[PDB]
């Protein structure tokens with residue numbers, strides 16, 4: 627394939643090197659491609675990037691649904707989502723690339739034109755869990771949305787700013803977190 | 813001084829042009845030093861930069877020392893340090909230089925050495941708030957080292973991954989975190 631072969635090197639580039647660190651030239655070089663390929667469906671570089679997030683985000687979002695069955699009550703759905711995100715190979719490994727891209731593009735409002743659409747799948751997992759949890763009376767959350775975002779980010783914090791130490795110690799901290807969090811919701 | 817003079821100018825460059833773009837050649841000339849003197853003092857740009865960060869960390873620690881005097885209880889110091897971490901980084905000139913350096917030298921397990929000591933100094937702040945919380949019974953924690961790593965990285969997450977909402981909602985979200993988190997300790 628051509629496109630699915632570009633996104634295959636581009637993603638690997640954004641992960642290994644930063645966002646800025648990987649150049650369109652590089653992608654085209656280890657893909658035997660040209661400049662044209664990037665025009666009709668692959669416009670700007672930020673387009674290629676925002677696209678890889680979308681894919682990744684979904685591969686993750688999907689692995690979560692084929693793996694959340696192992697969780698009975700939402701309280702378990704909370705711990706488990708926060709645990710899996712630490713071991714996934716999807717999206718979360720690009721967080722660094724994202725940090726850059728989210729600062730190298732603040733003046734250009736053409737970003738949030740589809741950026742926040744991604745931010746939604748980001749807090750959706752937490753939005754369902756916190757809500758369906760009210761139903762199951764597992765807790766009483768009145769501001770589900772704030773909490774949804776607070777959780778997603780806090781979690782992304784622990785996954786991202788601890789990507790160097792013993793993976794097992796990580797699963798430990800993240801767990802004490804979920805625990806301390808949910809417990810603070812009642 | 814010629815050492816501080818290198819640091820002064822170096823920090824200004826990094827702020828103006830970033831980490832990658834600043835050459836040690838600029839630093840050397842603009843600071844009126846020599847390649848020899850710059851090498852003898854820092855060896856590399858990586859260390860020089862790591863050296864500024866150390867100094868910034870220290871300015872942060874003093875600022876925090878003079879600021880926390882607005883928080884009587886460690887319960888308020890917690891809210892305050894968190895908010896402080898959000899507001900101040902918002903207009904931090906180096907932010908961008910750090911992001912480059914960080915997401916460009918975290919691949920080298922070498923630089924991760926001094927890099928860990930640093931972050932830890934930023935986490936001690938919490939360790940301290942929690943230990944003094946215990947000794948004052950605002951809460952009970954036996955794993956102060958853990959929660960501190962948690963809080964610090966959850967806060968950090970909430971700061972970094974939400975560089976989009978309006979500064980006013982962000983603080984609400986952070987004070988909402990501070991609240992929940994702190995409540996999950998009793």
Ligand SMILES: COc1ccc2cc3[n+](cc2c1OC)CCc1cc2c(cc1-3)OCO2
Nearest residue numbers: 868869871872896897898900901931934968
């Ligand atoms: C010279 O001024 C400085 C210098 C250095 C600063 C460093 C940090 N902050 C302000 C600073 C500042 O504010 C004025 C905000 C809180 C914070 C949390 C962190 C972190 C670094 C910092 O890494 C881990 O989590």
